[PDB]
């Protein structure tokens, strides 16, 4: 998830600064329904940043392992 | 498709903390502030305070008198209800009903019988004279168990027998907004499911209900504030004469579900056993025949038209039939069975209701026999199988069913009729030179297992098809 | 992030910068997280981690290929 963050943080952060003046004039929903629509989708994300934080340490175990393999068969 | 809007206008905007300033400098320098914290209500995540303004909010929507007094204990505060929960008097009970949809999620109905405690208070009385008609409620409520126990005391015999074939029906309890329900009808057909045993354990919603609650009315009766029986016959109610009691402006109605297609003797019947009109204007009567079918095709709703256009079908594993109902017949007086459909039913005094009950149960199974004919099981341009049924109207929850005979090529008029709750006479009119096709205790007997027709006349053919 | 705006409007309500920083807190963390991710497409992930075992037991494969034999006669 890396374009996929940024444009999960563009969309939230500019929904965000949406919901300031409508609170303001006020004193909608369209604008709030994606706002839970993409607070569900990035907690998602960060998820699977992890997933990708454990999956890409996992490949450096593996790596390591056949770095020791290929010694050991040098 | 408004996040393309919302990611191109914020884009521009962006070529933030003076909207923060802006925003604060407007606020330092009613309805609506609170409408879109109520739609932000079901956003919110729950919690000791959240579900405080939840039920606030739904109290904004049932309109309630909105009064918080701790983080657990919340007290209603209206014109005729009272209750805690974790008027004239305290809560009646705090009812389990109460508390476990207040422990779950079960927050809309939370809303609803709050509204049945308005349904059970919703008269336009002086509130004075509310509780006395909720008296009179309560005098008749109070009178509504003695009948089943009566009942019981009359016999100790199964809940069926109670909703079928005895006095009253089945005593639904009243609960805040639920309201004292009777049962009288089920058939067999209806009855088993996928067979469903008779235990007290009930759902209160297999079947259909004859609710009870009083509504103020402009036309003034004497209700009994006091109980109308003090004393009381062995298997026989008594009812005392009222008064105490005042011309209180409403009388005891008997509420359904659903509009009962019922002839017109019935509602003479009505009228003449409970004394108040049951109409107190006149719809133009239409025959009882279209009635039912509309009764009997809209159970299981679509919303696609059937349109069967008189004729009807039955897609039956075992035969195939075509009905004719014939509305309108030639009869000697010109004229078939007309009726209109009903829910309301009005009664004075308790001693009114049990035998308004029998005539309805005469009225009901009539049209859930004839219903049985009326289907959505369409079968079409079948060759085989879809023999001439012409049923054909004879009195008031009565009819003959005349038809192609099987075997020869004469008719078999099959004379039929309602005669109580659930019993049912059974005739046999045939051609002249015609064989044995049934006996009509094997009719009855059917007729008294499932009441219907076209397996009747399945089973008629089978019999017939034996013989 | 939605805490954050949940913040923002609790605190807007009952009288912003903090929520920001915070948010700008998730954006570096995201950043830390983007180092594993699309670096590599997560689809070619999945094709070269059987590229990985294939390795791994070809390497085997070699390895008694050359211990199994008896070159002795």
Same mark, same amino acid.
């Not at chain 2, 005979?405 to 078999?412: F, G, I, K, Q, Y």
């Given at each position: 998830?890396?374009?996929?963050?940024?444009?999960?943080?563009?969309?939230?952060?500019?929904?965000?600064?949406?919901?300031?003046?409508?609170?303001?004039?006020?004193?909608?929903?369209?604008?709030?329904?994606?706002?839970?629509?993409?607070?569900?989708?990035?907690?998602?994300?960060?998820?699977?940043?992890?997933?990708?934080?454990?999956?890409?340490?996992?490949?450096?175990?593996?790596?390591?392992?056949?770095?020791?393999?290929?010694?050991?068969?040098? | 498709?408004?996040?393309?809007?919302?990611?191109?206008?914020?884009?521009?905007?962006?070529?933030?903390?003076?909207?923060?300033?802006?925003?604060?400098?407007?606020?330092?320098?009613?309805?609506?502030?609170?409408?879109?914290?109520?739609?932000?209500?079901?956003?919110?995540?729950?919690?000791?305070?959240?579900?405080?303004?939840?039920?606030?909010?739904?109290?904004?929507?049932?309109?309630?008198?909105?009064?918080?007094?701790?983080? /657990?204990?919340?007290?209603?505060? #209206?014109?005729?209800?009272?209750?805690?929960?974790?008027?004239?008097?305290?809560?009646?009970?705090?009812?389990?009903?109460?508390?476990?949809?207040?422990?779950?999620?079960?927050?809309?109905?939370?809303?609803?019988?709050?509204?049945?405690?308005?349904?059970?208070?919703?008269?336009?009385?002086?509130?004075?004279?509310?509780?006395?008609?909720?008296?009179?409620?309560?005098?008749?409520?109070?009178?509504?168990?003695?009948?089943?126990?009566?009942?019981?005391?009359?016999?100790?015999?199964?809940?069926?027998?109670?909703?079928?074939?005895?006095?009253? +029906?089945?005593?639904? *309890?009243?609960? /805040?907004?639920?309201?004292?329900?009777?049962?009288?009808?089920?058939? *067999?057909?209806?009855?088993?499911?996928?067979?469903?045993?008779?235990?007290?354990?009930?759902?209160?919603?297999?079947?259909?209900?004859?609710?009870?609650?009083?509504? +103020?009315?402009?036309?003034?009766?004497?209700?009994?504030?006091? *109980?109308?029986?003090?004393?009381?016959? *062995?298997?026989?109610?008594?009812?005392?004469?009222?008064?105490?009691?005042?011309?209180?402006?409403?009388?005891?109605?008997?509420?359904?579900?659903?509009?009962?297609?019922?002839?017109?003797?019935?509602? &003479?019947?009505?009228?003449?056993?409970?004394?108040?009109?049951?109409?107190?204007?006149?719809?133009?009567?239409?025959?009882?025949?279209?009635?039912? #079918?509309?009764?009997?095709?809209?159970?299981?709703?679509?919303?696609?038209?059937?349109?069967?256009?008189?004729?009807?079908?039955?897609?039956?594993?075992?035969?195939?039939?075509?009905?004719?109902?014939?509305?309108?017949?030639?009869?000697?007086?010109?004229?078939?069975?007309? +009726?209109?459909?009903?829910?309301?039913?009005?009664?004075?005094?308790?001693?009114?209701?049990?035998?308004?009950?029998?005539?309805?149960?005469?009225?009901?199974?009539?049209?859930?026999?004839? +219903?049985?004919?009326?289907?959505?099981?369409?079968?079409?341009?079948?060759?085989?199988?879809?023999?001439?049924?012409?049923?054909?109207?004879?009195?008031?929850?009565?009819?003959?069913?005349?038809?192609?005979?099987?075997?020869?090529?004469?008719?078999?008029?099959?004379?039929?009729?309602?005669?109580?709750? #659930?019993?049912?006479?059974?005739?046999?009119?045939?051609?002249?030179?015609?064989?044995?096709?049934?006996?009509?205790?094997?009719?009855?007997?059917?007729?008294?297992?499932?009441?219907?027709?076209?397996?009747?006349?399945?089973?008629?053919?089978?019999?017939?098809?034996?013989? | 992030?939605?805490?954050?705006?949940?913040?923002?409007?609790?605190?807007?309500?009952?009288?912003?910068?903090?929520?920001?920083?915070?948010?700008?807190?998730?954006?570096?963390?995201?950043?830390?997280?983007?180092?594993? /991710?699309?670096?590599?497409?997560?689809?070619?992930?999945? &094709?070269?981690? &059987?590229?990985?075992?294939? &390795?791994?037991?070809?390497?085997?494969?070699?390895?008694?290929?050359?211990?199994?034999?008896?070159?002795?006669?």
């Amino acid at each position: 998830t890396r374009e996929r963050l940024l444009s999960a943080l563009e969309d939230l952060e500019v929904l965000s600064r949406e919901l300031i003046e409508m609170l303001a004039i006020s004193r909608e929903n369209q604008v709030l329904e994606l706002l839970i629509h993409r607070d569900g989708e990035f907690q998602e994300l960060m998820k699977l940043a992890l997933n990708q934080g454990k999956i890409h340490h996992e490949m450096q175990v593996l790596e390591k392992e056949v770095e020791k393999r290929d010694s050991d068969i040098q | 498709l408004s996040k393309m809007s919302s990611l191109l206008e914020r884009l521009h905007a962006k070529f933030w903390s003076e909207t923060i300033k802006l925003v604060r400098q407007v606020m330092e320098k009613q309805h609506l502030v609170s409408c879109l914290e109520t739609l932000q209500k079901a956003l919110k995540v729950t919690s000791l305070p959240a579900m405080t303004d939840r039920l606030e909010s739904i109290a904004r929507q049932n309109g309630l008198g909105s009064h918080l007094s701790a983080s /657990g204990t919340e007290c209603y505060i #209206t014109s005729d209800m009272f209750y805690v929960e974790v008027h004239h008097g305290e809560n009646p009970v705090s009812c389990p009903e109460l508390v476990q949809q207040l422990r779950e999620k079960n927050f809309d109905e939370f809303s609803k019988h709050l509204k049945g405690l308005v349904n059970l208070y919703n008269l336009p009385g002086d509130n004075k004279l509310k509780t006395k008609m909720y008296l009179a409620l309560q005098s008749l409520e109070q009178d509504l168990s003695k009948m089943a126990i009566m009942y019981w005391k009359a016999t100790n015999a199964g809940p069926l027998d109670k909703i079928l074939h005895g006095s009253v +029906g089945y005593l639904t *309890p009243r609960s /805040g907004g639920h309201l004292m329900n009777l049962k009288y009808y089920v058939s *067999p057909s209806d009855l088993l499911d996928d067979i469903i045993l008779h235990e007290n354990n009930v759902s209160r919603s297999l079947g259909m209900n004859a609710s009870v609650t009083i509504e +103020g009315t402009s036309a003034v009766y004497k209700l009994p504030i006091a *109980p109308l029986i003090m004393g009381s016959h *062995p298997v026989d109610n008594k009812w005392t004469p009222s008064f105490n009691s005042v011309d209180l402006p409403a009388c005891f109605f008997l509420k359904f579900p659903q509009p009962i297609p019922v002839s017109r003797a019935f509602v &003479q019947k009505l009228q003449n056993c409970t004394g108040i009109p049951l109409f107190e204007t006149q719809p133009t009567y239409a025959p009882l025949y279209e009635l039912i #079918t509309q009764f009997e095709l809209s159970k299981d709703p679509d919303p696609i038209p059937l349109n069967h256009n008189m004729r009807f079908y039955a897609a039956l594993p075992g035969q195939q039939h075509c009905y004719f109902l014939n509305k309108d017949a030639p009869l000697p007086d010109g004229r078939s069975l007309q +009726g209109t459909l009903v829910s309301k039913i009005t009664f004075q005094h308790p001693g009114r209701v049990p035998l308004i009950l029998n005539l309805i149960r005469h009225q009901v199974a009539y049209n859930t026999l004839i +219903g049985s004919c009326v289907k959505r099981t369409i079968l079409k341009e079948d060759s085989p199988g879809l023999l001439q049924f012409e049923v054909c109207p004879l009195s008031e929850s009565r009819f003959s069913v005349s038809f192609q005979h099987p075997v020869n090529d004469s008719l078999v008029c099959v004379v039929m009729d309602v005669q109580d709750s #659930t019993h049912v006479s059974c005739k046999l009119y045939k051609g002249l030179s015609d064989a044995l096709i049934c006996t009509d205790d094997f009719i009855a007997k059917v007729v008294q297992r499932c009441m219907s027709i076209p397996v009747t006349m399945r089973a008629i053919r089978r019999k017939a098809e034996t013989i | 992030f939605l805490p954050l705006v949940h913040n923002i409007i609790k605190c807007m309500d009952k009288d912003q910068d903090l929520n920001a920083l915070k948010s700008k807190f998730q954006e570096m963390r995201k950043l830390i997280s983007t180092m594993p /991710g699309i670096h590599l497409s997560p689809e070619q992930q999945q &094709q070269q981690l &059987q590229s990985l075992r294939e &390795q791994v037991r070809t390497k085997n494969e070699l390895l008694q290929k050359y211990k199994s034999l008896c070159m002795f006669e």
